[PDB]
Design a protein around this ligand. Structure first.
Ligand SMILES: CCCCCCCCCCCCC/C=C/[C@H](O)[C@H](N)CO
Ligand SMILES: CCCCCCCCCCCCC/C=C/[C@H](O)[C@H](N)CO
Lengths: 238, 251, 285, 59, 238, 285, 59, 60, 59
């Protein structure tokens, strides 16, 4: 017949190949396609949906709803910091089990901007203003409102609209960062402080709470598929 | 912009503090078309005797309340002619409008999540066991989430953090949902189309979706403010169709 | 004849240049109560430069995400024994016994696709005191039985005639066997979750096992030989293609318990840290 | 002879390939790896009334 | 020669493949084709032909022609049911060995409407009317004529035309049902009752019999080929 | 050059919409005495909606029904013995010894097609007290003898010269051998049933064996070796293609008895139930 | 070069393939799996006089 | 299938061959190209640059 | 069918070849052995003012 020569790679099984193969059921007639609502075409459509962040992950609260609430109150507490955490959307305990984190843990590289939305859940008679700040890598995290005000920040005024968005913009020396972040691809930190304080009238509860949502912007993308470290078994039939 | 009115059949709902309306995936309910049908007999369409608002019984939101759930259908099987059309046919199909009401004063605080979960399959508190239908649903009465891990036989594992499905409760925002923040609004509204892998189905055998109401920020108040704060649900079927008329089944 | 097919590349959005502002437009003030997610970009909150972005979302599409091979079953069978049920392997078809592929599939409620199936078979010698013999190449038979077909009772049963069932014959030392399967379900799409029963009285079997019913696999040695016993292991690999999925779900948090249910043990939301303000210091001399 | 020619995945800052189908069933064809569509508004903006994003959400 | 690489599936024997192969008799000249009557092109042409149903399959009658006759008589017998059976065209003992049943047992899935024809084989002087009813799944089978009248039914009047057709329409939640039917893909039941009773003059036999034929409609189809469980051997040469 | 060939898809009929009626048209009243089967649809007896049906009758055509491989013969032969007739296998060609394919073929009176033939050969070691030797690969020869050709007497007979008979040589460890056969019969179509005799005096041989006469198959080992004896088994598989069939028949009810006749033992029509009204109740709490 | 291009079996609610014949005999070609004709009236309506189905069968 | 015949050289590994091979990472999206100064296209561009010669290569 | 035909490397003092791409990724293609460009002035003449080579370098 036709003369041929076999090259390296013959008769191997590569688990990401793309070839044709014979059908074991010739001329099988499939069920017609139905137009079901809610079709998904890209995994980035799921990561653009808000999900609640467990900011209060301290001892004794890992299995209660208190893990989701950030506490604030009235009185002179300006010297106290409200919250703070690192920007590691697939590594930090604060972000790793959210929707965005769960999608990122299937990949090795990520890039893009990140949205954090904050909602105030106090009484309708309480007033206050907060400062939300993001610092780039290169220094230690700020220890006072004066230090934090020097980075990228927004001043949130509580009112009829309940929600304020802090957008973290992509500021990096490389095009992509690692999902398993090290010191070389660090991304910075976020902190919150009292800008004025909380003021309430008589007859209202003094303590209030804040909630935080995370999602991805429209310039976000990931690459380099891998297996996730969150699921495991010790034997078959599981 | 905050006032809304909804009319269906001989029933109407007004509201003065609404946020907006969620349409589940951008799809409104509609009837089955000819190039997607498989059952051949002519279907019945009652159209005002079934497509109207029915109100369930209310629950009491207390300072330490974990949350509640209902299963749809089977929560409307004793509701007027919708239930009677459910009992005499083999196949049914319908979308829904859900409306949750809870009002309070400007000196109260709290936040509720209202979410509709399609095909919410649940697990037993005994891991080497199976669930029964009484533990899944009580009709128009609500099931109650728990505060810790549950034990004993035949009950559903219902600690709120896992939502009884083995997931994180903070991710339930992937489904159609709204929030009731007591300082902002007093009602939630969701419009749900028919969602299934087959065009029609039997309404006694299959729960199409679960409605969950979960408080994230508990209810709080001060010296002499009102202590009783109820929550109320109201549901209306839409584009209701039935096929396969025979004698009435008996549960 | 040649036909040119065009492929549209899809990249992410560019960021536009923006300057100072003082007005009544408040892009950063929203309300999450509506169920709506804010569509704000960095150019709405800070001053930005113009960047031309060339990144592509190609590896996060559903097809590239799911089109890889994964192990779904492993099993053993002998050439010589005193049980006659350990001379062949058999199992019911599903994708619920290996947790990686099954957690990946359960991100969606409904799925529809064709499949590519591969088998990897290995053999070994059973530990005996006296070794030493030359054995000819071993041949293996794999038979698929759709629901309702007769079931083999032994390795010499008439049912291995495979007159209408599809089978594979293979011999060791060659490439692994492979074949493709179309979308075979009596419904319009596969169902990963089923909140219902099998009997109209709201009892019987609950959940997933009500709906799958896709047959069984049987595997045997063909030689019928080997005075010294041997043992084979077979592994099966699935690869979906021409995919469509609907209704996304939150990813599984708790560990799996068995292949039938969604049963779980209560787990935490995450691990702890020192306090709500704790920062690890990394810039120290 | 029923040949398809299409472009390859390259970078940015000779490039096409040829395919022939050998089998009678379409379930035997290789995967469709080069279709990139999106529709995120189905999950992120499922509201009846449109929200402008420069206007307040309420009032 | 030309460089090549072997993929998985090489050198296997799949019993439903479709390839080319060399001829062992090159240039053999075949006998010309003759135009024989009765050519068959599809198995559904056979399933659309009526065949007699053994409705009376009770003990003591499995090898006599009495297995095919349904008994009816004159007098007050309204409270007695005439016949009843399940709709399982490939599973029930009543339907499994007919033409339609025999064709279905080579397949796994079926769909479509089913025709039942009833013929009265009494004297020319006997009169009567019957009610033929089909109930959909979801309830137990009716116990009286009042219950049965609520489903899909027809009233048959015996006269110069001897035959009446009850058409069972496809009412199902899925596109296909299993040939090996379970509780999930059940299809219902059929029952017969006296609408008025049988009236005869003097000089005529009192007892009469009815026969039933089954066939498939023009929207019927099957899929997923398999082997049949009705034939078997214990050794070669059989 | 390229030529486009069009394939017409064939789907089932749609059901049309129908309303109430009160007239003299009686579609449901017929008469079976004519030998005619009623062509009534649901829309003639009840009220119906319009449905667009997309189902296809593709897997029930005769070609897709019969174009699969089935076993038709299995046989054994040795490399060393004291009989010299057990050193090779031989048999007469037909499709009457395995009941599955032969019941499937007997749904019709006459059939005409080409064939694809495959062989599956396996070997094994004979049980001896002393084991241990290395054996080179075995080679096998398959020869087809049309009626009238000389018959081998041993494994060293001159007739294996195969000068004009077609033969296959094969060695173990390779793909199974395969070849195609055209429609070889002195008639215009094959005959599955023959209600006649061989002699004009209405006696002699009755039935099927009068008409087939299609030759024999002989198989041997080529090595002529093996001081320690081995045993091989050969299996043959048929697959018809380019098919035409005539005059359908009722399917076989009784079990087969031998390969020559249609002889049978009387069997029942079906199994029993309780009474002509018996209903299994399945809706119970 | 004597190539045939025809459509593949798909569903309902790029899709063609190529074939070349290699051998001199037509008995070597692959099966004809894509021919779907029917003529049921040969077995279900084999009567000399036509029956309308809305009219009585007799009289 | 198509009849073929294998020639000498089959299944060998020649370290200067030039063939095609399957990708282990289908549809991977590479980082965009940057215009870095000092690109080299031929080794003869380096040999045309002056370098100092050690002419006094004696002991010590 | 997406075939490329180009000239072979010969001497100086029938000669072309054919290539087809089989895979979807360009990282699977063979090496680019036939591109011969040069730009030595980048390393040998990197000066701001041009030097004529028949003129003195200074003065
Ligand atoms: C013997 C040769 C053929 C080998 C038999 C392999 C056929 C396997 C049946 C195809 C089943 C594939 C689809 C099943 C997977 C489940 O649906 C997924 N877990 C989602 O439901
Ligand atoms: C040695 C290489 C060739 C192998 C010989 C195989 C040739 C077999 C002869 C062809 C016979 C095929 C047709 C015979 C089958 C019967 O006619 C059917 N049972 C129906 O009559």
């Amino acid at each position: 017949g036709l003369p041929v020569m076999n090259t390296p790679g013959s008769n191997q099984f590569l688990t990401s190949d793309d070839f044709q193969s014979p059908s074991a059921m010739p001329q099988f007639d499939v069920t017609p396609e139905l137009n079901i609502p809610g079709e998904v075409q890209n995994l980035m459509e799921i990561a653009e949906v808000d999900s609640v962040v467990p900011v209060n992950n301290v001892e004794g609260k890992l299995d209660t709803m208190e893990i989701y609430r950030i506490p604030v109150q009235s009185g002179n507490h300006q010297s106290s910091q409200v919250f703070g955490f690192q920007v590691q959307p697939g590594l930090d305990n604060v972000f790793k089990h959210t929707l965005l984190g769960e999608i990122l843990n299937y990949y090795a590289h990520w890039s893009g901007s990140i949205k954090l939305t904050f909602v105030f859940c106090g009484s309708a008679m309480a007033t206050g203003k907060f400062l939300l700040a993001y610092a780039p890598p290169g220094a230690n995290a700020p220890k006072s409102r004066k230090d934090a005000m020097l980075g990228t920040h927004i001043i949130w005024d509580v009112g009829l609209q309940s929600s304020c968005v802090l957008c973290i913009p992509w500021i990096s020396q490389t095009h992509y960062r690692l999902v398993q972040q090290d010191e070389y691809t660090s991304a910075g930190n976020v902190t919150c402080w009292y800008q004025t304080g909380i003021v309430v009238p008589a007859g209202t509860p003094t303590s209030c709470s804040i909630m935080c949502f995370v999602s991805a912007c429209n310039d976000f993308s990931v690459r380099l598929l891998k297996d996730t470290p969150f699921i495991e078994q010790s034997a078959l039939l599981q | 912009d905050r006032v809304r009115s909804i009319t269906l059949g001989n029933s109407t709902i007004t509201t003065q503090e609404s946020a907006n309306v969620v349409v589940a995936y951008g799809r409104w309910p509609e009837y089955l078309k000819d190039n997607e049908a498989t059952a051949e007999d002519q279907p019945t369409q009652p159209d005002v005797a079934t497509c109207r608002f029915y109100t369930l019984e209310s629950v009491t939101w207390e300072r330490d309340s974990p949350g509640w759930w209902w299963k749809f259908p089977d929560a409307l099987k004793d509701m007027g002619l919708f239930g009677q059309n459910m009992y005499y046919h083999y196949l049914g199909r319908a979308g829904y409008t859900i409306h949750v009401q809870c009002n309070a004063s400007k000196f109260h605080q709290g936040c509720l999540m209202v979410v509709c979960v399609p095909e919410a399959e649940m697990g037993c508190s005994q891991v080497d066991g199976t669930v029964n239908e009484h533990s899944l649903s009580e009709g128009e009465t609500a099931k109650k989430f728990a505060s810790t891990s549950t034990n004993g036989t035949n009950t559903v594992q219902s600690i709120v953090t896992n939502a009884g499905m083995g997931v994180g409760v903070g991710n339930l925002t992937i489904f159609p949902h709204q929030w009731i923040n007591l300082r902002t609004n007093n009602c939630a509204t969701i419009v749900m189309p028919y969602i299934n892998n087959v065009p029609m189905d039997n309404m006694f055998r299959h729960h199409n979706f679960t409605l969950m109401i979960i408080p994230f920020v508990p209810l709080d108040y001060s010296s002499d403010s009102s202590t009783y704060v109820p929550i109320t649900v109201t549901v209306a079927p839409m584009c209701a169709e039935y096929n396969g008329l025979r004698l009435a089944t008996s549960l | 004849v040649v036909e040119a097919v065009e492929n549209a590349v899809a990249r992410v959005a560019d960021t536009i240049s923006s300057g100072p502002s003082n007005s009544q437009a408040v892009p950063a003030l929203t309300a999450v109560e509506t169920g709506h997610t804010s569509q704000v970009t960095p150019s709405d909150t800070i001053q930005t430069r113009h960047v031309r972005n060339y990144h592509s979302r190609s590896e996060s599409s559903i097809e590239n995400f799911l089109c890889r091979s994964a192990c779904v079953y492993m099993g053993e069978y002998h050439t010589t024994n005193t049980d006659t049920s350990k001379l062949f392997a058999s199992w019911t078809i599903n994708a619920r016994r290996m947790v990686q592929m099954r957690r990946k599939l359960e991100l969606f409620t409904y799925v529809r696709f064709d499949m590519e199936v591969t088998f990897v078979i290995t053999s070994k010698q059973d530990q005996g005191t006296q070794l030493g013999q030359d054995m000819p190449p071993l041949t293996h038979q794999i038979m698929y039985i759709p629901p309702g077909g007769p079931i083999p009772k032994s390795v010499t049963d008439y049912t291995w005639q495979t007159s209408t069932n599809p089978s594979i014959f293979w011999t060791e030392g060659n490439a692994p066997p492979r074949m493709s399967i179309p979308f075979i379900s009596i419904g319009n799409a596969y169902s990963n979750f089923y909140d219902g029963w099998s009997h109209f009285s709201q009892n019987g079997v609950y959940g997933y096992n009500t709906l799958n019913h896709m047959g069984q696999i049987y595997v045997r040695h063909v030689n019928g030989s080997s005075p010294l016993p041997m043992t084979s292991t077979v592994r099966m690999y699935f690869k979906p293609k021409h995919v469509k999925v609907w209704v996304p779900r939150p990813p599984r948090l708790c560990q799996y318990k068995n292949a039938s249910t969604v049963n779980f043990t209560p787990t935490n939301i995450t691990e702890k840290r020192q306090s709500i303000n704790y920062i690890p210091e990394t810039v120290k001399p | 002879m029923g040949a398809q020619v299409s472009t390859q995945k390259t970078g940015a800052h000779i490039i096409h390939y040829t395919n022939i189908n050998y089998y009678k069933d379409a379930a035997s064809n290789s995967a469709n790896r080069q279709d990139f569509s999106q529709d995120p508004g189905k999950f992120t903006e499922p509201v009846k009334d449109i929200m402008v994003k420069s206007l307040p959400a309420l009032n």
